[PDB]
Design a protein around this ligand. Structure first.
Ligand SMILES: [Ca+2]
Ligand SMILES: [Ca+2]
Ligand SMILES: [Ca+2]
Ligand SMILES: [Ca+2]
Ligand SMILES: [Ca+2]
Lengths: 37, 37
């Protein structure tokens, strides 16, 4: 199982993160909207 | 963007495919419930 699925679902839920994910990826997009720095 | 996202969503929707996906993967699980052979 993929440990990142929970975060991937969170991002999909956020249109802005979802859309962005298609360009720079999910892990980098998640960080952009939720990471600190 | 990942071209497989549509199929991944289909599988997640199917509990049986979802569960199975965690063990042998999504592409092999999808094939198991929807592929022909
Ligand atoms: Ca999921
Ligand atoms: Ca999903
Ligand atoms: Ca998406
Ligand atoms: Ca999706
Ligand atoms: Ca899943």
């Amino acid at each position: 199982p993929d440990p990142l699925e929970p975060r991937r679902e969170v991002c999909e839920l956020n249109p802005d993160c979802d859309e962005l994910a298609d360009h720079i990826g999910f892990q980098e997009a998640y960080r952009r909207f939720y990471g600190i720095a």
